[PDB]
Amino acid sequence: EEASSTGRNFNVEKINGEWHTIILASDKREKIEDNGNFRLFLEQIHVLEKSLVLKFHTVRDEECSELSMVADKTEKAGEYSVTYDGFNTFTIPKTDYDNFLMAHLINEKDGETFQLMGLYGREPDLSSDIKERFAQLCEEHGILRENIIDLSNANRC
Ligand code: NA
Numbered sequence: 001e002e003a004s005s006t007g008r009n010f011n012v013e014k015i016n017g018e019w020h021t022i023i024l025a026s027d028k029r030e031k032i033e034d035n036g037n038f039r040l041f042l043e044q045i046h047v048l049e050k051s052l053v054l055k056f057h058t059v060r061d062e063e064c065s066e067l068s069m070v071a072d073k074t075e076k077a078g079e080y081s082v083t084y085d086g087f088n089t090f091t092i093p094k095t096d097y098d099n100f101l102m103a104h105l106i107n108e109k110d111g112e113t114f115q116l117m118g119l120y121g122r123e124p125d126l127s128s129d130i131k132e133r134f135a136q137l138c139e140e141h142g143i144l145r146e147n148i149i150d151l152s153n154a155n156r157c
């Protein structure tokens with residue numbers, strides 16, 4: 001069964017645990033390119049009463065650097081906010097809990113904005129069918145495939 005974080009039947013406890021960054025996408029491609037601040041490799045999501053603790057690592061010159069962020073629930077169900085390289089809010093438009101998680105985030109910094117979409121998997125990779133479903137979801141948000149980057153062969157330290 002699939003759900004959206006903004007849907008009535010969403011069960012946030014079910015996204016707890018191990019996750020891996022499979023694909024990242026953005027309408028500002030530089031943000032997820034090699035030295036981008038949003039080229040983030042997820043490791044786990046810890047679900048709390050009104051927050052999610054996100055554990056990630058970034059990579060630079062082949063060196064991994066850990067980072068944790070706390071995302072707080074906002075006034076809208078299914079929406080979380082977090083301060084990181086500006087102000088971010090995000091939702092999970094689609095997850096099946098057991099294989100994949102698709103997130104949609106809006107970043108605002110210095111009076112600007114951009115959209116970030118991420119495809120996360122329970123294992124370090126996902127099937128081609130799930131990756132195509134993600135490309136379709138990015139298209140629905142106006143993000144071209146040329147701005148979608150598969151990081152499945154670069155998500156391990
Ligand atoms: Na730039």
Ligand code: NA
Binds near residue numbers: 124125126
């Ligand atoms: Na694989």
Ligand code: NA
Binds near residue numbers: 136137140
């Ligand atoms: Na579509």
